[PDB]
DNA sequence: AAAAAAAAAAAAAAAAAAAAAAAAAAAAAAAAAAA
């Protein structure tokens, strides 16, 4: 079931990129319900969203792919457990944002 | 607080109009021959 998850990762990577918006909803849905979990290959998943950020639209209804995404990061990188102080939260939200640009490319 | 109804968008198939290309017919012009 773990190995046929992965080619799911796979395949979702490349329907990131397609033309339906509710596809790419429910696909970026996919990833950050895998990378809750610790699957490995879900941080490549996730990786592929951060180029998302492109792909812009002037239509005001339902949540586009770029809204989306903030609230994705938001979720993923951007919270810290709600036991936690105030000065904490900004040095595990720091902490992410870090490790966010260790191992990138120029990309 | 949840469900139902209405509106908008998406996908597939079909139809209409315009543009381009092809074919046919008619007319005009030129040259040659005969009385």
Same mark, same amino acid.
């Given at each position: 079931?773990?190995?046929?998850?992965?080619?799911?990762?796979?395949?979702?990577? !490349?329907?990131?990129?397609?033309? !339906?918006? !509710?596809?790419?909803?429910?696909?970026?849905?996919?990833?950050?319900?895998?990378?809750?979990?610790?699957?490995?290959? +879900?941080?490549?998943?996730?990786?592929?969203?951060?180029?998302?950020?492109?792909?812009?639209?002037?239509?005001?209804?339902?949540? +586009?792919?770029?809204?989306?995404?903030?609230? @994705?990061?938001?979720?993923?990188?951007?919270?810290?457990?709600?036991? @936690?102080?105030?000065?904490?939260?900004?040095?595990?939200?720091?902490?992410?944002?870090? !490790?966010?640009?260790?191992?990138?490319?120029?990309?």
């Amino acid at each position: 079931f773990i190995k046929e998850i992965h080619k799911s990762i796979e395949l979702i990577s !490349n329907l990131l990129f397609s033309k !339906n918006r !509710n596809e790419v909803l429910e696909s970026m849905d996919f990833l950050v319900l895998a990378d809750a979990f610790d699957i490995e290959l +879900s941080e490549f998943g996730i990786k592929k969203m951060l180029h998302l950020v492109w792909m812009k639209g002037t239509n005001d209804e339902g949540t +586009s792919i770029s809204v989306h995404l903030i609230e @994705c990061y938001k979720q993923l990188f951007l919270t810290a457990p709600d036991s @936690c102080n105030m000065q904490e939260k900004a040095a595990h939200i720091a902490k992410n944002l870090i !490790n966010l640009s260790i191992g990138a490319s120029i990309a």
